[PDB]
Design a binder for this molecule. Structure first.
Ligand code: 3C4
Ligand code: 3C4
Lengths: 208, 208
């Protein structure tokens, strides 16, 4: 929710383009290339990221005085919709120059807003041992679905690393590291249609 | 993140500070009110949490910008990994830069936006704001690979406690209880003793 509302932007809306949106209309469309900052004069906007597989995850809720800082291409596919009657002011690069030439302080208000967002998201990435969750998942899977094949358990299941990451809330880069380490230590080998457990005892132990 | 090589043209407007390998660019608890341009060298920048736990935020090299012009309320610690030359730009000294070249405002916006785009995508990937989804995904994966079809239903044989579901998915046990109760009420899935019955795989697949 609310990011360093830029309330002083209220005074410069005459220098951008007003765009009003009815409840449920898409303020940003999937694959729409936005090259404007969007000021929320009043309303509520829900902004999501759409990953390259079509999953749609919430980033934030924007309300009165919020700034959507999407002045340039980002590599994230964004989809934003109005959740009430929303009035917005759109500020292209050209119109921001007009703002800065009137009031230089506005450059620093916008820095503060971006800075608030980096501080917020970076801290959350950091806040989130998540590794134990992958071990608990393999342990529960092995102990109920695992078939004894000589001195190994086999779980017949196409469980992609993407699915492991989604189930456990573990970043896709940590999943691959955990699995590499599991293989190297002769514990578990996560192949394509099967998972092979060589050491159920140590797996149980690591997981508890 | 977007490097700002052009800021090398304006270091005479800032304060040059050199750091030896291993020395602190930013000290624990230091109040930073300057952007820090890395002319040459290499910096590791960590967040320090209130328990004393330290976590990487990023590595920075040639032409990188540390955007900490205002207090954020994170405790940050940043060390030189090699001998490093830096240029410190206060708000005043940044105003002198922008009076000379208005485009440096927008170069800094791009740098900031690249950082929000990077951290926000990571937060979004991990379903931080909709962690219930990790539960649906667990059930969906289990059913699609281990489910046996019985009329218009699937049976999975799996002793799985709510405490286990929460430990696997990183989801609070109260949310776990609420999700299992709603699944059963909506006739989607029921976990009856050691058997998971899915009545509506299609709907469970849709939700996850
Ligand atoms: O567009 C992006 O990739 C991320 C994003 C979304 C909304 C914002 O207000 C910002 Cl600064 C960035
Ligand atoms: O200081 C912070 O809280 C986060 C931070 C760290 C480094 C940076 O370059 C930025 Cl823009 C923010």
């Amino acid at each position: 929710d609310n990011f360093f509302p830029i309330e002083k932007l209220r005074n410069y809306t005459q220098m951008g383009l007003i765009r009003d949106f009815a409840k449920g209309s898409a303020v940003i469309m999937p694959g729409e290339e936005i090259t404007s900052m969007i000021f929320l004069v009043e309303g509520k906007i829900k902004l999501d990221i759409i990953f390259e597989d079509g999953s749609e995850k919430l980033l934030y809720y924007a309300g009165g005085n919020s700034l959507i800082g999407k002045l340039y291409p980002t590599g994230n596919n964004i989809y934003a919709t109005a959740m009430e009657p929303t009035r917005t002011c759109w500020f292209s690069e050209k119109s921001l120059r007009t703002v800065f030439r009137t009031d230089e302080d506005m450059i620093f208000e916008i820095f503060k807003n971006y800075l608030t967002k980096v501080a917020y998201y970076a801290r959350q990435v950091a806040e989130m041992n998540p590794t134990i969750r992958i071990l608990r998942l393999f342990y529960e899977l092995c102990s109920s679905q695992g078939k004894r094949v000589g001195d190994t358990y086999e779980i017949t299941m196409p469980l992609s690393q993407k699915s492991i990451g989604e189930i456990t809330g573990v970043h896709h880069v940590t999943v691959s590291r955990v699995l590499a380490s599991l293989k190297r230590e002769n514990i578990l080998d996560k192949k394509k249609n099967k998972i092979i457990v060589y050491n159920l005892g140590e797996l149980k132990h690591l997981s508890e």
